[PDB]
């Protein structure tokens, strides 16, 4: 997101606005803004790996924007879109990944590619070497926003089961 | 395995009548040992279990969403007013004898997935099989009935 400096509302604000985002939602539910149509008037910017040596980023769109839960500069030029989009495809499936250890994330991101579920829908047509399809593939009760874009809710990985963290004597 | 690097396998199986069971009769699908919790430091697994339980009760499917502002305190209040214990614990009875267990236990739904490394492709044995040509030794290959 690009952040203009001088606002007639005083302090500092990012240029995009509620009217624009309403127009976006309307375009979505039409089922004629695009991402490109949002580009062509200076609302977002593509930034390579170097201009970060020339710019300044805000986490939230509120973090310094007005002048027992969690513990959380006035020259911002950009604010990032959403901090969860520093992740990758596999790691966007781990629920609450900010709430555990990083090597555990790395293991999970490795193991998830070994999971089985569906993989496509024309699988009744495609001859293939080895295929693995399970019976009753359920979307997960917990979820995050990204896996909506990953179409994961449409093609789930496994089933969800009732667990119990006990030591029932043996095994 | 879970979504947190808790890979593991099935030890043995039980039916319901000797699976442990709670007061409402929700007999669990599977039980894993508590010692996989602290040394693996996998808190988010627990948080997911709690949130998933309250999501299933409310109907509203849950939300993981990494750098948001959802806290376990809010989850706890919501689940308490749905009418269960504020930390997801549960009174539960030894399905052998019906007696109460002493310590209450954790309980809830959680998302798993089934991995491809199945035992039927890894069991292998050989006594006096086929035999290599260049070195006159037992051949390779689990599929090829090797040693």
């Amino acid at each position: 997101f690009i952040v203009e400096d001088d606002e007639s509302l005083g302090h500092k604000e990012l240029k995009v606005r509620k009217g624009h985002i309403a127009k976006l939602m309307a375009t979505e539910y039409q089922d004629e803004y695009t991402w490109s149509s949002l580009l062509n008037e200076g609302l977002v910017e593509y930034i390579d790996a170097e201009e970060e040596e020339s710019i300044l980023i805000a986490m939230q769109p509120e973090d310094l924007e007005p002048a027992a839960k969690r513990i959380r500069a006035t020259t911002f030029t950009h604010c990032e879109i959403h901090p969860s989009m520093i992740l990758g495809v596999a790691a966007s499936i781990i629920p609450f990944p900010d709430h555990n250890q990083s090597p555990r994330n790395t293991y999970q991101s490795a193991m998830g590619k070994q999971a089985m579920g569906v993989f496509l829908t024309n699988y009744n047509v495609r001859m293939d070497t080895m295929a693995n399809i399970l019976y009753y593939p359920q979307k997960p009760l917990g979820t995050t926003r990204a896996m909506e874009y990953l179409k994961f809710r449409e093609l789930p990985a496994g089933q969800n089961a009732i667990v119990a963290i006990a030591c029932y004597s043996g095994y | 395995a879970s979504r947190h690097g808790q890979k593991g396998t099935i030890g043995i199986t039980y039916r319901r009548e000797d699976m442990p069971f709670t007061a409402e009769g929700i007999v669990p699908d599977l039980i894993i040992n508590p010692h996989a919790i602290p040394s693996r430091m996998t808190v988010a697994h627990l948080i997911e279990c709690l949130l998933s339980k309250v999501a299933a009760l409310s109907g509203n499917e849950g939300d993981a969403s990494p750098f948001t502002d959802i806290t376990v305190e809010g989850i706890s209040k919501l689940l308490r007013e749905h009418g269960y214990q504020s930390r997801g614990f549960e009174v539960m009875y030894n399905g052998h004898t019906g007696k109460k267990l002493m310590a209450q236990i954790f309980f809830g739904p959680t998302y798993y997935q089934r991995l491809r490394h199945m035992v039927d492709d890894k069991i292998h044995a050989r006594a006096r099989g086929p035999m290599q040509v260049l070195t006159r030794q037992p051949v390779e290959g689990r599929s090829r009935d090797g040693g």
Binding site: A22, A26 | L51, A55, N60, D63, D69
Partner: peptide
């Protein structure tokens, strides 16, 4: 303070339906 634990869209769908 409501802390937003789940999802919702269609309230805003009708919100712009009558804001238009």
């Amino acid at each position: 303070t409501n802390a937003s634990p789940f999802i919702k869209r269609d309230r805003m769908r009708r919100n712009f339906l009558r804001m238009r």
